[PDB]
Amino acid sequence: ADYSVLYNSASFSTFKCYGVSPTKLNDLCFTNVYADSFVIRGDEVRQIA
Amino acid sequence: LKPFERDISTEIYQAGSTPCNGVEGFNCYFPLQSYGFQPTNGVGYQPYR
């Protein structure tokens, strides 16, 4: 993992971690990370949460 | 906070590279949140003296 280049990238319009801290993600070990990607509107980002 | 320590600072909390404490911006949250007590809330959500 290497989320430190993505937390300090400062090029995103949405970046929040839920149930976990967004300041530690390259120190917490996990098992499987599933990435789902989709593009929506600007009046539909708040619905996805 | 340490035993018998009180906070009087209103600074904005700094998250990530982007500085805060009044230079408000992306990842600049205010830690002091309101409780929001109402009688319509649950009994675990009501004020305790």
Half-sphere exposure of B1 toward its Cβ, with a 13 Å CA cutoff? 7
Give residues with Cβ within 8 angstroms of A16, minimum separation 6: A22
The resolution in angstroms reads 4.2
* Nearest-neighbour CA in chain A from B14: distance (Å): 11
Give the closest residue to A17 by CA, choosing from B35, B27, B20, B21: B27
Beta strands at B13-14 and B28-29: parallel, antiparallel or unpaired: antiparallel
Asked if A22's CB is within 8 angstroms of B17's CB, the reply is: no
| Cα maximum dimension of chain B | 41
Token pair 């675990």: residue:
B44
Kindly provide the residue ranges of all beta strands, DSSP E only, lying in B1-49, ordered along the sequence.
13-14, 28-29
Q: Is A26 on the interface with B (CB under 8 A)?
A: no
Give the CA-trace dihedral at B10, B14, B15, B18, to 10 degrees.
Answer: 140
Give the closest residue to B11 by CA, choosing from B33, B25, B36, B30: B30
Both tokens assigned to A12: 């995103």
Technique behind the model: cryo-EM
* Nearest-neighbour CA in chain B from A8: distance (Å): 6
